[PDB]
């Protein structure tokens, strides 16, 4: 409308508000709103950014903030104009506004801008969003504020390529720790998502996360009723146990394994997979830690999963079994063999995925090596797991691989095609 444009650029606060309110309602109507039609109008987005500065009018500041938030949702191209209009620095000022409504919609706006990409996330961090954002948590705010603030926080910590500079996001760790004591499912879920991102990386980042005290509460949230909390809690836990052996003991001490054994029976397939994945990171542990998994009765369930679950779950359980065989003692491997791990591992050798075959081959290799230890404990010179692998895999297939002439043929065929046709 031309009265929308007139009233917007006019100099009366009544008409300014009235026009802006009609602008919001068009971007609030639910079917993917007309963002570009608004953004293309000359000086209109910059006019909304000018309204954010008007500290003596709560309603107008909120309506403006609501509008720019919704423009900020959607395309990167659309979210570009909001940044270039210079709204980020001003939204961060509004985090210290005297009106709650304004403070809270500023956070949401910035959450959207932080969520657009790696480069927008860092700019927001480089405009010092964090100090005022963490100050929101410093008072008894309403529940919707707390949710919006943690959600924004999680968007600041998010992204792997490249991740945020750790010194800019790690100060939020103290807040995240006490937020795991809140009951609200939305806040718990996003607090966990934030932590899963912060512990995704080298072991110095995991040390900062453990140092904040979060592992016990994380481990406790693996038993929540809502998969919205369990998924991210499980993702954080799984990442922390990609730590050295000290770091992963920190989680075992919180009794994670009985909770992990429970999540292996989950009806939700992605939780099953994530629980295998987590457990495989622990079985990459020391023999002590492999024994704790044995004593929790985890392996019968992993072996069941290894032979009946869908591929992507099967692959994680394979990693779990194989890491156990890389690190474990002869007696621990003997037990895994007695629960029947060789057959499922052999069955993976025929699957058309080179990554799972690598893992399966590595586990069979480790089993066989320890079978040489048992072939000198008993003095026969017979590896006991030779006959078992033969039973599982087939004499045909063993005979094919026993041929050095077959080995020479494949080596040459691979070498030849890769050289003249290129590798792929």
């Amino acid at each position: 409308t031309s009265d929308m444009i007139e009233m917007i650029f006019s100099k009366s606060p009544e008409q300014q508000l009235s026009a802006t309110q009609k602008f919001r309602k068009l971007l609030s109507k639910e079917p993917n709103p007309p963002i570009d039609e608004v953004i293309s109008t000359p000086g209109v987005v910059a006019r909304f950014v000018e309204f954010l500065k008007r500290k003596e009018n709560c309603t107008l500041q909120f309506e403006s903030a609501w509008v720019l938030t919704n423009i900020a949702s959607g395309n990167s191209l659309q979210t570009r104009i909001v940044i270039q209009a210079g709204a980020v620095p001003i939204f961060i000022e509004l985090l210290s506004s005297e009106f709650e409504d304004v403070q809270e919609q500023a956070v949401w706006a910035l959450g959207n801008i932080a969520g657009d990409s790696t480069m927008c996330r860092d700019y927001v961090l480089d405009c010092n969003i964090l100090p005022p954002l963490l100050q929101l948590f410093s008072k008894q705010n309403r529940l919707t504020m707390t949710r919006n603030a943690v959600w924004a926080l999680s968007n600041l910590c998010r992204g792997k390529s490249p991740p945020p500079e750790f010194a800019k996001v790690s100060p939020c760790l103290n807040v995240l720790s006490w937020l795991l004591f809140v009951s609200d499912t939305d806040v718990l879920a996003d607090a966990c998502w934030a932590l899963s991102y912060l512990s995704d990386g080298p072991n110095d980042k995991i040390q900062a996360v453990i140092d904040a005290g979060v592992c016990r509460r994380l481990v406790e949230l693996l038993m929540h009723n809502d998969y919205k909390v369990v998924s991210p809690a499980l993702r954080a836990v799984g990442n922390i146990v990609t730590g050295d052996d000290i770091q992963t003991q920190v989680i075992l001490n919180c009794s994670a394994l009985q909770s992990l054994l429970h999540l292996l029976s989950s009806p939700k397939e992605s939780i099953k997979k994530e629980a295998c994945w987590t457990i495989s990171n622990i079985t990459a542990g020391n023999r002590a830690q492999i024994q704790t998994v044995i004593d929790a009765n985890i392996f019968p369930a992993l072996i069941s999963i290894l032979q009946t679950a869908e591929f992507r779950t099967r692959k994680e359980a394979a990693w779990a079994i194989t890491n156990a065989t890389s690190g474990g003692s002869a007696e621990q491997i003997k037990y895994l063999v007695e629960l029947g791990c060789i057959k499922p591992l052999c069955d993976l050798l025929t699957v058309m995925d080179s990554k799972i075959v690598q893992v399966a081959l590595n586990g069979l290799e480790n089993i066989l090596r320890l079978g040489e230890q048992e072939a000198k404990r008993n003095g026969t010179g017979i590896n006991p797991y030779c006959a078992l692998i033969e039973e599982a895999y087939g004499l045909d297939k063993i005979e094919f691989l026993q041929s050095h002439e077959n080995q020479e043929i494949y080596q040459k065929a691979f070498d030849l095609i890769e050289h003249y046709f290129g590798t792929e």
Partner: protein, 65 residues
């Protein structure tokens, strides 16, 4: 020494030149979780490895009436 480090690494095969020059056993602890790299395991023996320990919602929201 060597096998105390390599314990935590799955050996994938021999040197694969497209993953860069070979690392030492000491550089190996800085290899990113999930990435692959060549290491000198000894003499002229270069091998491709990865770590056994492996790392892992709505990005934006619109306000409506």
């Amino acid at each position: 020494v060597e096998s105390a480090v390599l314990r935590g690494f799955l050996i994938l095969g021999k040197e694969d030149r497209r993953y860069g020059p070979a690392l030492s056993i000491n550089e190996l602890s800085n290899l990113a979780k999930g990435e692959k790299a060549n290491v000198l395991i000894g003499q002229g023996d270069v091998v491709l490895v990865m770590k056994r320990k492996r790392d892992s919602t709505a990005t934006k929201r619109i306000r409506m009436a």
